Design an enzyme around this catalytic site. Structure first.
Site, PDB file in Angstrom:
ATOM      1  N   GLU A 238     -16.327  -2.742   4.154  1.00  0.00           N
ATOM      2  CA  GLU A 238     -15.809  -4.050   4.547  1.00  0.00           C
ATOM      3  C   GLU A 238     -16.056  -5.194   3.571  1.00  0.00           C
ATOM      4  OE1 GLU A 238     -16.109  -5.221   8.754  1.00  0.00           O
ATOM      5  OE2 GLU A 238     -16.404  -7.296   8.131  1.00  0.00           O
ATOM      6  N   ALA A 406     -24.609  -2.010  16.787  1.00  0.00           N
ATOM      7  CA  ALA A 406     -23.447  -1.705  17.600  1.00  0.00           C
ATOM      8  C   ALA A 406     -22.998  -3.002  18.247  1.00  0.00           C
ATOM      9  CB  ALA A 406     -23.813  -0.680  18.676  1.00  0.00           C
TER      10      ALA A 406
END
Length: 435
Positions: A238, A406
């Protein structure tokens, strides 16, 4: 200036990771290796180092430090320092901490003293490595003999890795996720990214580990560094921020990832889920909207747009779902303003970002430092490339560890989320080379 053809076998990643040891004029000289889709740049040695902390700005040159207080926005302070650094070098390298993006939310008062925000340096020498060749620049051309020597004897071979257990939960990740879900159910925020660290019970060889991991991970960006007492390596698919010399700015929020290369049936099943998963789709839409709004605050009016919306990018062992947001930097803005406008990455903090960052201060182990921060490359022509650091390993003060998180939302189950962290860690845990 000088070039050396990259030989038959000799993988570029292997040569690039081993270069530091031979070009490094003495010691455990600091360095940073940055990969841009098959193009490696080694910034070896520190000519000048800029250290931006929460309470001070230092410029270190040959053991001589220049301390001073800074004020205003961190992007402004860092930009001014780096702009001066780039007066003496064509490129600067370093990393930006997660904490660099808290000032914009009025949370900097929560940072302990001496919290690092950024570390950027002008290298003593730069070497570029590709599948095609090795390029030396200026004075660095005198490393020709050493490099030719390395190619003659061949690079160290990579021994077997040593396993590590990621099943223990000493930081109570599961309990912290339960707390977040409760806050979200209460409406305090929509999503927050929480994480946990996994300690590696043995010293690892970073260059060897980087090389082994790079043969199983093929990210658009990757890095290996030894800077100011910190050793770190990572694979980053990313791009949090990229600014081109012409003013074009890009950010690429990643929506989700699935394994790839496990056969037709399995792979297509994984892809269908990746492109139809309501949860990931909604969160990605929200992240894309967030990035558009953020980039709009520093772009020329009407230049912001989403290119390649929800497209799948196959990268060897994995396939990612994401989007590219593009704009033109406003003539009254700068690359640093762009970085801080998109910091911290919405995909690694939360929604609303302000509320997410605040929760991270309460429910995650802080400072996060390099984790969820970025490794950067800046050019004298105005360029900036910042890769989001998530899948990485660190060694500091004698401790070695990995960190994974997460995204937590209202429906999240602590056990399922704990499992997600195990899945992410598995992209690195099987490639740790000891010593």
């Amino acid at each position: 200036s000088s070039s050396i053809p990259m030989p038959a076998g000799v993988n570029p990643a292997d040569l690039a990771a081993e270069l530091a040891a031979v070009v490094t004029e003495s010691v455990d000289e600091d360095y940073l290796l940055y990969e841009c889709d098959g193009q490696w740049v080694l910034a070896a040695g520190v000519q000048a180092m800029v250290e931006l902390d929460s309470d001070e700005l230092r410029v270190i040159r040959d053991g001589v430090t220049r301390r001073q207080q800074w004020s205003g926005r961190p992007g402004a302070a860092l930009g001014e320092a780096v702009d001066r650094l780039l007066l003496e070098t064509d490129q600067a390298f370093g990393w930006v901490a997660f904490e660099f993006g808290v000032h914009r939310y009025g949370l900097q008062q929560r940072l302990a003293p001496h919290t690092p925000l950024a570390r950027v340096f002008s290298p003593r020498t730069r070497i570029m490595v590709s599948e095609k060749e090795i390029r030396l620049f200026d004075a660095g051309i005198r490393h020709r003999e050493a490099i030719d020597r390395l190619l003659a004897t061949g690079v160290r071979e990579v021994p077997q890795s040593r396993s590590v257990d990621v099943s223990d939960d000493p930081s109570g990740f599961r309990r912290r996720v339960a707390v977040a879900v409760d806050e979200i159910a209460a409406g305090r925020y929509h999503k927050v990214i929480l994480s946990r660290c996994v300690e590696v019970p043995f010293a690892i060889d970073f260059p060897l580990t980087y090389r082994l991991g790079r043969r199983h991970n093929t990210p658009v960006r990757s890095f290996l560094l030894q800077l100011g007492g910190i050793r770190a390596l990572g694979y980053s698919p990313e791009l949090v921020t990229a600014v081109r010399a012409d003013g074009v700015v890009i950010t690429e929020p990643l929506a989700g990832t699935r394994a790839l290369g496990r056969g037709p049936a399995i792979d297509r099943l994984a892809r269908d889920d990746l492109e139809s998963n309501s949860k990931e789709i909604v969160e990605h839409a929200i992240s894309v909207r967030s990035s558009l709004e953020e980039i709009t605050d520093i772009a020329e009016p009407g230049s912001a747009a989403v290119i390649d919306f929800m497209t799948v990018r196959e990268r060897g062992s994995v396939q990612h779902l994401g989007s590219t947001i593009r704009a033109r930097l406003d003539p009254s803005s700068d690359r640093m303003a762009a970085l801080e406008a998109l910091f911290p990455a919405v995909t690694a903090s939360g929604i609303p970002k302000a509320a997410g960052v605040e929760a991270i201060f309460r429910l995650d182990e802080c400072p996060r430092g390099l984790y969820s921060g970025a490794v950067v490359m800046l050019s004298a022509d105005g360029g900036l490339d910042a890769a989001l650091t998530l899948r990485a390993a660190y060694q500091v003060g004698g401790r070695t560890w990995l960190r994974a998180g997460a995204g937590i939302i209202e429906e999240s189950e602590p056990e399922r989320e704990f499992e997600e962290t195990c899945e992410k860690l598995s992209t690195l845990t099987p490639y740790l080379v000891a010593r």
